[PDB]
């Protein structure tokens, strides 16, 4: 159905900043939910930041909650997870992701849909 | 045929000037009150959203051809999609009377919520734009449909219902940059 | 019309052409009108297409005018009155009335058109427009405006909701 | 009467379905109803 | 009582082996006035006459199943072909007329149909041709076979350049036996007239 | 009975021709509008999929029925198994038309979606075959009933409502390799 | 008929036995026939099926046919026109009239017949049809071409869909 | 008051400076139908429509008697063309209309005539120049001119490869003059259209 | 009607269920029913 393309990956150091984005390759007209897993080297996957479409609705996780920002683009219908002051524990496999079937807050970092393969993302010291 | 071209006086010439013949047609589609009928969506929404017919986007079937009238009356239709109890509040309501459940409150079924509600603004007709203020760009406050308010609302859509339009506007199609046409992919089978 | 203007202006040249244009409401000269505004949200029309051409010279000033209708079948349209005689046409020179209407045809195939061009595809499924300038008098500067309203017959057809939101 | 496809009357009354108008006009139908046609001057047919 | 005289504008064509005349799928023409072309159209009765053209060799050494069709309209150099390169739109039906002429000493038969929206045939469909206004041609019994098609399409006109509704086809069904007395080749043609032309949209010149 | 068989007069002798005598019968089921009212299956399905009825497989009752005339007409009706939202836009329309709400969406109930399509070809009939092109093996591109779109569609059912056929073509059996007919394994209870 | 041919050709030999086939719409004669193409997708039939044979041989060359329908019963259909002589049959020469049309009756216990023929079983549940060439006077390789139609009380009953897709 | 608009065919033409319509000879066509051509005739309708020629400059320096011909039937392109080309004995009638547009701050005059039986004419008898249908343009008052003549000829059918029965003539009658408010030149166009054109006698083709 | 078989009428009018057809004949039918039966020349029952 849906494929998901990421960009804006790569390397970086401490102090600096990356910027992530996902586009999906159909644009129907749903309310789905962007999120950014990572999965850090030798770890489980686990939620960093989602938006929802219809408004700018922000979740975030208690690691990241200052320092990461994520907007989405309605023109371009793209989504974009801005990385700031990176800590060397961000070093992980970042991986996008979908969720069409239901919109609701309190639900919005539990089941998502399609995936993408991730990208991958080694800051250094 | 010719005619005075300054005195503005509509002219209507038909195939019927070289030998043609003006052929029957039917206007079902471009009728007013047929047009505006259809759910059109809504993509800003709170926790508390005042239903304003000036929020639908500019450039839509309905958003459009609402912005290419003056003045409009219409009831209302909503398709909201909310966790919780929805309230609905009508034109003038405190922002305090959308907790209680002495006004339309719907206790959420599975997919989502479908009502209709009335027009209660307090003026013979809404308008799309305004030229001057109502205190003592920005439209007056009390060119609204009421509000509702849910814990959080995920999608809000809605259809107006006996749409009566007046006083038309200017209404603009997409520019072409340097081409003889705009051309654009249309839909044809595979292979 | 070219530089963005609604009008034509007679040329001190041996090019007789003042403008030629698509039969589609989707053309370049018609995107800034009220009939191709409505025929954006639509899928397929039929009917008549009114024009109407109103000079704007001095009175001091005389003009011959012509308009034909090419329909499709030839690849290039013509650039010569001499050899657009043979299609549908109108002449009409300037005096009191200073206002002029002609009502392009709906010759087709099917039943209906679509109020849509498909793709980089050339040679626009319905013909083109052409004004030309028969000849003038002392009219060097002077101006032809064009506007388009829709006809007796016409009609849209299958509403839709086109445009990236 | 725009875009409603059923036969049967509704359930519930006039009332409550949608307001009701009070009293105390198509314009543009009219506009273009009494558009000029024909010709002007003499013709040669 | 098998002499057949038809008459197309100012063209004859008399047979005395006639069969019979086919009508296929209509005994005449529908509205040829409609709404697409919005009343600016016109008939021309001078085109509506015949032309001859040259469609196979009947040889002694072509099977069953051995197909030549012509696509209608064809390539024409009188008044029809200038009505085709100088109006954007036409329609007319066809009134078609093929001869095979050998002696009544031969034996064989030919499948004569007019197949609408021509597609190539496998070798199992050619046993289902008869599903087409036809008629056969037997040299036992006649040399000539008629049909007369309407006009028909997706569209109630047609641009030529681009469509071709019509197609003539002749199969050979049994292969032709000669002996010493009877003609060892036979040469086949076609006798073509448009029926009810219908023009729309004249076109600019090219001088 | 014998009869001119060049003329190509059609022919139906009796068993009174010796004696016998004919049968009432009833064609029901060999109705043109009967046959071609079922659903059937297309299973060349996308993300976006473009209605096109010479999709079906050839070799099915209603694949096979249909590619056995030239022309025809018919309304339609889909049953779409989808996941979100499935929009359905009209013959003509751009492709960029699918993303927007405000054409024909369906919000997706549980099992799947089963909604009926009217006929909105410009043709007044549409062709299994085409001799020649469109533009200036494949049929023209507006030979379709509009176009669906979803996030994935997994399953799509068409049916042919007040059917109409033209002008019949060659509709061929499978074919018997060296046998005397050709035997196949017909239904029959156990033991 | 054998070699995929139309039609079946007079012989020079002691044998008379034009073409047999089995009275089925799965037959190997009629496989390619529109009647066998509509009754693969129906479940049971009923009714007349009819025959017709057109002589394509030259003015000096006569024979004479016959046609005979032989219901189930025996093991193996018969090879002679005298001992198939005392079945349903008809016969017919050659002259001016070049067609002739034969009605295959429908003979059964059921009111209904299978469109298809089961397994491996043999011995077709209808009977078959078989041609004969009583005399030919100078027909060496003239043909005689065989076709055919549904009757007039002829019925199919039962759709389905049968094919592998 | 003086609005005329002209329909031949599927094109019109309309001016505002219109003084009249001049009919030559003739208000309409005799019979079309003669012993001639033997039943064997048929009207063609669209070929009767408009088309466009250029005629010549008028400037200041041309003198009175300075005269300009277009021999009918011109060079045609389009319907009329394959006509003349494709049967070989037509006959038809003319409806002309000159257009000499300036401004109303010129002078000068123009004679328009149609002459049958074209010859040249001497110095001295281009006084005599309105015995023929015609009118005349004057930038004071018109800036066109509208003649409608038959067929006429010592023949009912005509071979027109090989005659032109008429011949459109424009005579500068008054030299232009012109002032610094004024069009310093004048370009004169014809708009010609055929009228009940007959034909008879098909040709065989090229291709 | 082909393939309908409830008796009550439809919910939805008849401008909504499916597409109008405008106006401005089976070939095979008559075609059919206009063959040729009986026999040629004499019968000798």
């Known amino acids: 159905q849906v494929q998901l393309q990421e960009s804006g990956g790569g390397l970086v150091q401490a102090g600096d900043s990356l910027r992530l984005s996902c586009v999906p390759s159909?644009?129907?007209?749903?309310?789905?939910?962007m999120g950014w897993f990572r999965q850090p080297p030798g770890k489980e996957r686990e939620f960093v930041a989602a938006?929802?479409?219809?408004?700018?609705?922000?979740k975030y996780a208690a690691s990241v909650k200052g320092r990461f920002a994520i907007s989405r683009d309605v023109a371009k219908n793209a989504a974009y997870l801005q990385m700031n002051s990176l800590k060397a524990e961000d070093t992980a496999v970042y991986y996008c992701?979908?969720?069409?079937?239901?919109?609701?807050?309190?639900?919005?970092?539990?089941?998502?849909?399609?995936w993408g393969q991730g990208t991958q993302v080694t800051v250094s010291s | 045929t010719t005619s005075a071209g300054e005195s503005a006086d509509p002219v209507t010439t038909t195939v019927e000037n070289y030998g043609g013949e003006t052929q029957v047609q039917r206007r079902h589609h471009t009728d007013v009150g047929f047009i505006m009928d259809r759910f059109v969506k809504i993509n800003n929404t709170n926790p508390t959203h005042v239903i304003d017919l000036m929020q639908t986007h500019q450039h839509g079937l309905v958003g459009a051809l609402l912005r290419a009238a003056t003045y409009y009356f219409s009831d209302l239709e909503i398709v909201v999609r909310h966790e919780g109890n929805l309230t609905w509040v009508p034109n003038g309501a405190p922002e305090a009377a959308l907790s209680n459940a002495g006004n339309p409150t719907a206790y959420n079924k599975a997919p989502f919520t479908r009502l209709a509600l009335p027009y209660t603004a307090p003026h013979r007709v809404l308008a799309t734009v305004y030229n001057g203020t109502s205190k003592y760009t920005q439209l007056p406050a009390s060119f609204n449909f009421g509000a509702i308010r849910a814990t959080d609302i995920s999608e809000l859509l809605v259809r107006m219902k006996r749409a009566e339009l007046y006083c038309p506007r200017p209404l603009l199609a997409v520019e072409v940059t340097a081409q003889d046409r705009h051309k654009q992919k249309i839909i044809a089978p595979a292979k | 019309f070219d530089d963005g203007k609604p009008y034509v202006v007679t040329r001190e040249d041996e090019q007789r052409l003042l403008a030629k244009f698509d039969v589609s409401l989707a053309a370049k000269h018609m995107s800034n009108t009220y009939l191709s505004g409505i025929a954006q949200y639509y899928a397929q029309y039929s009917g008549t297409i009114n024009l109407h051409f109103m000079f704007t010279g001095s009175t001091d000033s005389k003009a011959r005018y012509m308009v034909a209708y090419v329909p499709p079948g030839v690849e290039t349209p013509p650039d010569t009155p001499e050899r657009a005689a043979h299609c549908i046409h109108a002449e009409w020179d300037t005096g009191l009335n200073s206002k002029f209407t002609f009502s392009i045809p709906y010759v087709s195939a099917a039943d209906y058109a679509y109020t849509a061009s498909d793709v980089a595809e050339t040679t626009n499924v319905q013909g083109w427009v052409c004004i030309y300038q028969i000849t003038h008098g002392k009219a060097q500067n002077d101006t032809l405006v064009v506007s388009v309203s829709a006809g007796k017959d016409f009609e849209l057809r299958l509403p839709i909701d086109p445009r990236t939101q | 009467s725009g875009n409603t496809g059923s036969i049967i009357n509704n359930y519930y009354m006039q009332q409550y379905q949608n307001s009701m108008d009070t009293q105390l006009n198509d314009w543009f139908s009219k506009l273009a109803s009494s558009a000029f046609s024909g010709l002007f001057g003499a013709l040669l047919a | 009582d098998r002499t057949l005289t038809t008459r197309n504008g100012h063209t004859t064509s008399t047979t005395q082996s006639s069969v019979g005349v086919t009508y296929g799928y209509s005994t005449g023409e529908d509205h040829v006035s409609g709404p697409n072309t919005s009343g600016l159209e016109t008939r021309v009765t001078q085109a509506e006459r015949f032309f001859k053209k040259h469609l196979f060799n009947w040889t002694t050494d072509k099977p069953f199943g051995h197909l030549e069709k012509l696509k209608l309209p064809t390539d024409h150099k009188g008044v029809y072909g200038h009505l085709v390169d100088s109006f954007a739109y036409m329609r007319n039906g066809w009134d078609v007329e093929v001869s095979a002429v050998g002696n009544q000493f031969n034996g064989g038969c030919l499948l004569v149909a007019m197949v609408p929206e021509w597609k190539k045939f496998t070798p199992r469909e050619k046993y289902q041709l008869t599903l087409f206004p036809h008629q056969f041609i037997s040299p036992r019994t006649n040399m000539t076979a008629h049909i007369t098609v309407p006009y028909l399409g997706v569209n109630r006109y047609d641009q030529y350049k681009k469509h071709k509704p019509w197609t003539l086809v002749v199969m050979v069904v049994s292969p032709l036996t000669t002996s010493s007395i009877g003609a060892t080749e036979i040469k086949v043609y076609a006798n073509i007239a448009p029926t009810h032309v219908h023009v729309a949209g004249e076109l600019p010149s090219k001088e | 009975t014998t009869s001119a068989g060049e003329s190509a007069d059609p022919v139906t002798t009796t068993v009174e021709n010796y004696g016998g005598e004919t049968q009432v019968q009833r064609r029901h089921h060999t109705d043109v509008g009967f046959i071609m009212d079922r659903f059937v299956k297309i299973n060349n399905t996308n993300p976006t999929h473009v209605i096109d009825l010479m999709q079906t497989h050839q070799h099915g009752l209603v694949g096979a029925l249909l590619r056995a005339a030239t022309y025809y007409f018919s309304d339609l009706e889909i049953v779409v198994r989808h996941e979100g939202n499935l929009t359905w836009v009209p013959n003509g329309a751009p492709e960029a038309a699918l993303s927007n709400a405000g054409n024909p969406t369906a919000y997706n109930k549980a099992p799947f979606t089963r909604l009926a399509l009217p006929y909105t070809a410009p043709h007044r009939v549409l062709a299994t075959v085409y001799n020649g092109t469109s533009k200036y093996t494949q049929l023209p591109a507006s030979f379709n009933f509009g176009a669906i779109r979803a996030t994935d569609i997994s399953e799509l059912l068409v049916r042919m409502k007040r059917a109409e056929l033209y002008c019949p073509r060659p509709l061929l059996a499978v074919e018997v390799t060296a046998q005397d007919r050709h035997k196949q394994k017909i239904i029959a209870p156990a033991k | 008929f054998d070699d995929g041919k139309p039609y079946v050709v007079t012989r020079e030999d002691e044998q008379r036995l034009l073409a047999k086939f089995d009275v089925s719409l799965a037959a190997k004669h009629m496989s390619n026939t529109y009647l066998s193409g509509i009754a693969q997708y129906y479940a049971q039939y009923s009714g007349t099926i009819n025959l017709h044979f057109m002589f394509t041989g030259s003015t000096d060359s006569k024979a004479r046919y016959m046609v005979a329908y032989v219901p189930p019963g025996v093991e193996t259909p018969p090879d002679t026109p005298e001992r198939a002589a005392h079945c349903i049959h008809a016969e017919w020469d050659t002259g001016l009239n070049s067609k002739f049309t034969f009605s295959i009756p429908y003979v059964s216990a059921a009111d209904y017949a299978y469109t298809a023929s089961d397994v491996a079983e043999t011995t077709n549940v209808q009977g078959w049809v078989c041609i004969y060439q009583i005399t030919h006077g100078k027909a060496q390789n003239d043909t005689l071409v065989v076709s055919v139609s549904a009757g007039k009380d002829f019925e199919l009953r039962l759709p389905i869909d049968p094919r592998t897709q | 008051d003086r609005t005329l608009t002209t329909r031949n065919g599927h094109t019109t033409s309309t001016t505002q400076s219109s003084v009249g319509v001049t009919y030559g000879y003739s208000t309409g066509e005799d019979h079309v139908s003669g012993p001639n051509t033997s039943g064997l005739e048929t009207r063609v309708t669209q070929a009767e429509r408009f088309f466009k020629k250029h005629l010549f400059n008028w400037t200041t320096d041309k003198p009175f008697g300075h005269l300009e011909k277009l021999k009918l039937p011109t060079d045609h392109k389009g319907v009329y063309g394959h006509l003349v080309d494709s049967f070989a004995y037509m006959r038809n009638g003319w409806d002309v209309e000159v257009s000499a547009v300036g401004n109303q701050f010129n002078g000068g005059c123009l004679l328009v005539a149609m002459v049958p039986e074209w010859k040249k004419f001497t110095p001295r008898e281009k006084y005599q120049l309105t015995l023929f249908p015609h009118q005349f343009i004057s930038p004071r008052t018109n800036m066109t001119a509208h003649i409608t003549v038959p067929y006429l000829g010592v023949n009912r059918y005509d071979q027109y490869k090989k005659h032109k029965p008429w011949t459109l003539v424009v005579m500068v009658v008054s030299p232009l003059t012109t002032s610094s408010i004024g069009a310093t030149e004048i370009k004169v166009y014809a708009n010609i259209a055929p009228t009940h054109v007959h034909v008879a006698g098909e040709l065989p083709s090229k291709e | 009607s082909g393939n309908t078989g409830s008796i009550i009428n439809n919910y939805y009018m008849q401008q909504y269920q499916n597409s109008m057809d405008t106006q401005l004949n089976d070939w095979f039918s008559k075609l059919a029913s206009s063959a040729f039966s009986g026999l040629f020349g004499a019968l000798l029952a």
């Open positions: 992701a979908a969720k069409y079937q239901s919109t609701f807050y309190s639900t919005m970092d539990v089941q998502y849909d399609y």
């Open positions: 159909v644009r129907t007209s749903d309310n789905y939910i």
């Open positions: 938006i929802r479409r219809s408004d700018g609705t922000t």
